[PDB]
Structure formats: C-alpha cells, structure tokens
Structure 1
Amino acid sequence: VPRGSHMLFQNVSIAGLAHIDAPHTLTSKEINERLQPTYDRLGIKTDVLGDVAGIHARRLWDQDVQASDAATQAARKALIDANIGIEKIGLLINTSVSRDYLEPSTASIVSGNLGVSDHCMTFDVANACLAFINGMDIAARMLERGEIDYALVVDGETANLVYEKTLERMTSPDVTEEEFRNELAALTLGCGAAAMVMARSELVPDAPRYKGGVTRSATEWNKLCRGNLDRMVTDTRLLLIEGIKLAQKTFVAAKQVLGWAVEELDQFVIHQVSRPHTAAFVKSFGIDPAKVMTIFGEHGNIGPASVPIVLSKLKELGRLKKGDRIALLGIGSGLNCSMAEVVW
C-alpha cells in the first residue's frame, strides 16, 4: 500500500559534526563554598546543586570570549570533520541563546570569521534550547529542495556573565529566599559550542540521514524560564511538570509520523537540563536509561548546543553504528517540544 512521506525530510544528511568543551572548570564545590553563608541564612542544608540538580561541575570561557568566537571554533572543527572547505557552504545558521549584539546577526560574524562566499545565506534563529533542531530543519528544507549543497548550523554559548552576576546577587546579605530560588538554575548552566555540516545525501552517501520530525507547543507557559545576558529566572517545578505534559503530547505525534516506539530506538539524545528532568523524562516514557547519554554532571546545561554536543560526543566515543536509530529531542522554554530522528 502506497504511503506518504509524512513530510519527513528526504535526502538530507549529516556530513560533519563537532563540539568544543570550554577550558575552565568551575566545580559545584567551589560555588557552594561561596554560597555557604547564604545557604546558612536560608536554612538550606542539602546540596541543591550537586545532589538535587545533579551538577558537579561546569565549564567556562575567559571573560572576553564571545558567542561568535566559540561558534567559529566549532564550525572550523565541523568543516574538518566533513572534509570540505568553507567555500562549499551555501547557508549558515546560528542558533545560540548567547548573542554578540542586537545586530548584526551572530551568524554574520561567524560567517565573516570563516570567510564564506558571497552566495552564502546567513541569519540567526532563536528558540531557547531547541533552536539547533530548528536550524537543522530550516537547512533541511533547502537541502531537500536542492537549493544548496551544504549548510552549517552553529551554536556557541557563553555563561560567564550570568555566573558572575548571579553569584554576586545570590551572595547578597539581603537576597530573599524567593529570588535565590528564582535564580538558582542559572548556576546549572554551562559554556560550550557545537557545529554541524548538513548536505544533500547524494554528496555523502554513507553519512547519517536526518529525517526531521514533530513539534508541539504550550506557549501559555512562556514565562516559566526567562533569561538575559546576565540573569536567568526559572520556575523549576512547573518547567518540569508542564515540560513532561507537553512531551507526552509530542510523543503521540512522533508515534504517528515517525512510527516511534521507544524499544526500537537505539539512542535518545535529549535536552540536558538536570538530573530530575532527565529522570522524569526517562521514567515517563519508559526509556532504557542506558540509551540516554548525559553530560549535565560535568558540563551543566549548554542550552541549544546541548543536543548536538551530546551527539558529537556519542560519535567521538564510538557509541554510534550504521543503522542506529537516534532520537533527538528536547523541551525548551516556550514551552516547545521537538522530536526528530537521525539514522546513523
């Protein structure tokens, strides 16, 4: 019986993938030492970072590293992984939450750094921690159509400033319990970068395929997590609960359009938000935890770069083999939930 493609992407591949780990380690132990007087004043006796959130360390850049710098570093690495020159790139999309300026785009700055040709289309996409997937989808539609041969999706996150200013606010003798709780999740963020080269499958016959997938939203929850360059406020409780509710809705759609059943997927590359988020997600959908790599523990939450960083790390570790069915998914501020598939 002839069936439709369910609008999944055809002939779109992943030609190259790379990640950058930021150089300076900041441990939760050091952070707690700094916060201890405030903990004591608030009567907080558990390690809310290392034991509850499950984050033991995260990485930071130097103060003077911009989103675009980190993104550029990842891009050059991904180009090498794809064994192609920048002159072949017809589209470059930057998907980071971190941003150099209001304008021009961070993508234009990265493109300038790399030396893209005058045919290269560039722009930023912003959608909290799901934007890398959005950028992949945007690139995929052009590649499928045959408009371009290769695309770069890039993402550099700088959390230095938010750490600096949050730690200052959270150690004020005047800080309230409410503001402390509001800003706590900022201390689970991490720096890092990722880049991906995507291509028409014709050019890279043995490369992984990207099929795309599905999205559902609950934009009535757009206030749950709000962040600027120096401050992030989060309702962690509702983020968790409403996130899981939305994911259940998305999974139903995934089953319909992707044919997903959890036992048949080989890897789940998921949003890296916290141990409790991960535990709840895995438990909600009856996922085998062995199929869910996490990096939150030593890198924290790297926003929209998290997913591709985890994928790149799976690649470098030799965890992925030809034929493996890889679920890429995330819940991001919005609220939004996207689920997509890669066949290695």
Structure 2
Amino acid sequence: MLFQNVSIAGLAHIDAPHTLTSKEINERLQPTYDRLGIKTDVLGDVAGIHARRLWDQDVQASDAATQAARKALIDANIGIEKIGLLINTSVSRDYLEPSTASIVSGNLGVSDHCMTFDVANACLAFINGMDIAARMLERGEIDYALVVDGETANLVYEKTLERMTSPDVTEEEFRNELAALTLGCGAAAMVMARSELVPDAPRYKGGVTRSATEWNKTRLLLIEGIKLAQKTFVAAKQVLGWAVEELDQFVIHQVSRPHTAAFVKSFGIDPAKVMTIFGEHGNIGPASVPIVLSKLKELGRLKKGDRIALLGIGSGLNCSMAEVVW
C-alpha cells in the first residue's frame, strides 16, 4: 500500500532577510509591560523564540514561494517545462481567488499542461501536498511535481504590535496576542518525481493521518495534540512499520520549545534526532517541515538509507506522519 515509485528530486528553502529579535519586541512592549505588571519574558524564556525573520515590504506569499521554487528546480536540475503539477500549501495566501499556486505558476512560466491548485490545512498542508502529488505521480499522470509554500507574517506583527501598545489594551486577551509573535517568515519548495526518472533520489513512502476535529472550536492544544499523535503513531506502526528507535530523523513542526520537549518526552524520542529552528526563525507554519528537511540536506546530515519521519500536529486538530528513505 505504500508508494513504490515516488521520489524527491529537489528541495530548497528561503530564509527571510530581516531579523526581529524578541529583545527588540520586548523593548517596544516594555511600557505596556510595566502597566499590568507583566515582569516576565514569555517569548524568550518560555516559548524559547529569541528571533524571527521578516520579509521586505510588499513581499507576497506567492513571491516567497516563487523564490523557493526556482531554487528547488535548480536543486533538481530540471526546467519548469517538466513540471506537470504545482500545489501551493501555505497558510498565507495572496487572494481567495485565484489560487496562490496559479500566481506562482505564472511567475515561473509553467506549460499549458500544468495543473495547479492550493491546499490549506494549517501546519500540515505541505505533507498533504506531498501525498496528493505522490498519488498523481504513482498513477502516471505527471512526471514531476512542485510543492511550494511561502509564509508571510509582516502584517501580523505590524497590526498586533500596534494593537498591544495602545492605551486601552487589556490583559486577559492580550496574552493571546503574544502567540502571533511566535510566527516567522520563510519559504520552501520540493520537486517530486517518478522514481525511474531519478535513481538514487530519496524515496517518499507516504504516511498516515488521524484527526480530532472535535477540538476545532494553546495549553489545551499541547495535551490533546500529544494524545492525537499517540493515536497516529499507533497507526504508523501498522502501515509504516515504524518503531521510534529505527527512525534516523524526526522532522517535526514546531509551535514552541515547551511543545517540542513534551513531544520528545512523550514518545521517548532521542532529542538529537530532532532538529529545531524555532529559536531563530519562530513558527513557519506548514513550511516548517520542508524548511527543516532542506536544512538537514544542505548540512550533509542525511545519508543514503536514513529513515526520516515527517510529522506535525496541526490546528483541527490533525496529525499526519510520513516516511522518506534518503
């Protein structure tokens, strides 16, 4: 039942150019801190986010996704004319209509045969996009697919910071405004291909999903997320043949340091097998997983035969887990 002929031909990520440190955020919030007596560095000391990146002004999700896509095409050594499917998986989107994917595709110059659309599913959508493309590849509908994802948070910082520093601002809800201050900009793209076209490329096996949509209505997210992941890992054991000790890397979405630690603790996972970029980049939504995988690749951390788990707990709640064999 697992995918037999689906590979990863190319992968890339883009780090956004402007740094906004939590120290800087705090300095701006200090007056509002002194009111309401906050006296605690939630971002730096609790969430463990010390910085995030922002794009230049007027960079759209499509722009960021396009930048990542160009780099992933180079990584795959293929021209855009080969791409038969382009899926955009980002939370950030240019418009409701048309798809952000169509705009990225127009920027790249895809052929008139190229099928495009957006998939949206909180921080899990890139994994969903990979599965969707894998099924088309497997059936022989296309030879190469792009899965792209650009996230923008400039506007959310501008508005939230502006809001939080107003004289009328009250606390109880304000504490929830801090959550948006864990988001970061970044982009990633992956070229997937039929395996007979790219021997020796990493193989995508597919995965499993379990949901708890009864919770679609942060402290709560943590516990219920781990409960859900436990269900999903049980499923993974059966369809993927997973055993924690047998996996070489866990590439996981990152909400915060506490959430990641609780996860590692719960599954008895070796923390050395869990790369994290949240400290410097914050939460890049559904782009997080492929950005981390790309960083692992560029750092030479991945060796032929490594078993790599891709996973996340997303708003929904949903939990998806998938395997790549490098």
Task: Name the TM tier (shorter chain).
Answer: over 0.9
SS, match of residue 18 in structure 1: strand
Cα separation, 1, equivalents of 2:112 and 2:21: 44
Partner of 1:232: none
Question: Can you list the C-alpha shifts for 1:160-213, whole angstroms capped at 9, x where unaligned?
Answer: 000110111111222222221222110000000000000000000100000111
Runs of 5+ unmatched residues, structure 1: 1-6, 224-235
Deviation string, structure 1 residues 6-30 (Cα, Å, up to 9, x no partner): x221210000000000000000000
Aligned-pair CA distance for 1:42: 2.4
Cα offsets for 1:118-140 (capped at 9, x unmatched) = 00000000001100000000000
Secondary structure at the counterpart of residue 112 of structure 1 = helix
**What is the CA deviation profile of residues 104-125 of structure 1, one whole-angstrom value per residue up to 9, with x for unaligned ones?**
1000000000000000000000
Which moved further from structure 2: 69-78 or 176-185? 176-185
> 3-state SS of the aligned residue for 2:35?
helix
State the identity as a percent.
Answer: 100
Distance 2:313 2:165 in 1: 30
After superposition, residues 245-264 of structure 1 pair within 5 angstroms as 245-264=227-246
**What displacement does 1:320 show?**
0.3
Find the aligned partners of 2:152 and 2:113 in 1 and give their Cα distance.
29
**Inter-partner Cα distance in structure 2 for 1:314 and 1:320:** 6
Q: How big is the shift at 1:220?
A: 1.4
The offset of 1:339, in angstroms, is: 0.5
Residue deviations 1:51-106, cap 9 Å, x none? 10000000000120000000000000000000000000000000000000111100
Distance 1:142 1:102 in 2: 25
Deviation at 1:309, TM superposition (A): 0.1
Query: Deviation string for 1:280-309 (max 9, x for gaps)?
Result: 100000000000000000000000000000
Partners of 2:211 and 2:31 in 1: how far apart? 40
**How does the TM-score come out when normalised to structure 1?**
0.94
For 1:189 and 1:115, the matched residues in 2 are separated by 31
Q: The residue matched to 1:73 in structure 2 has which SS?
A: helix
Distance in 2 (CA, whole Å) between partners of 1:172 and 1:179 is: 14
Matched residue, 1:50 = 44
Partner residue in 2 for 1:63: 57
Question: Could you tell me how far apart the structure 2 residues matched to 1:59 and 1:81 are?
Answer: 24
Question: 1:142 is matched with which residue: 133, 136, 140?
Answer: 136
Aligned-pair distance for 1:222?
1.2
Aligned-partner Cα distance in 2 for 1:307–1:44: 33
Q: Match for 2:318 among 336, 339, 342? A: 336
Give me the whole-angstrom Cα distance separating, in 1, the residues matched to 2:172 and 2:242: 41
Out of 88-97 and 256-265, give the one that drifted further.
Answer: 256-265
Q: Deviations over 1:202-234 (max 9, x none)?
A: 0001000001110000111113xxxxxxxxxxx
State the alpha-carbon separation in 1 of the partners of residues 36 and 48 from structure 2. 21
The alpha carbon displacement at 1:36 in A equals: 1.2
Whole-Å Cα distance in 2 between the matches of residues 305 and 188 of structure 1?
14
CA distance in structure 2 between the aligned counterparts of 1:183 and 1:245, rounded to whole angstroms: 26
Distance, in Å, in 2 between the alignment partners of 1:163 and 1:310 is 23
Superposition deviation, residue 43 in structure 1:
2.0
What CA distance in whole angstroms lies between the structure 1 residues aligned with 2:237 and 2:256? 26
Displacement after TM superposition at 1:47 (Å): 1.0
Give the alignment of 1:1-344 within 5 angstroms.
7-223=1-217, 236-344=218-326
Cα RMSD after superposing both structures = 0.7
Counterpart secondary structure, 1:339: strand
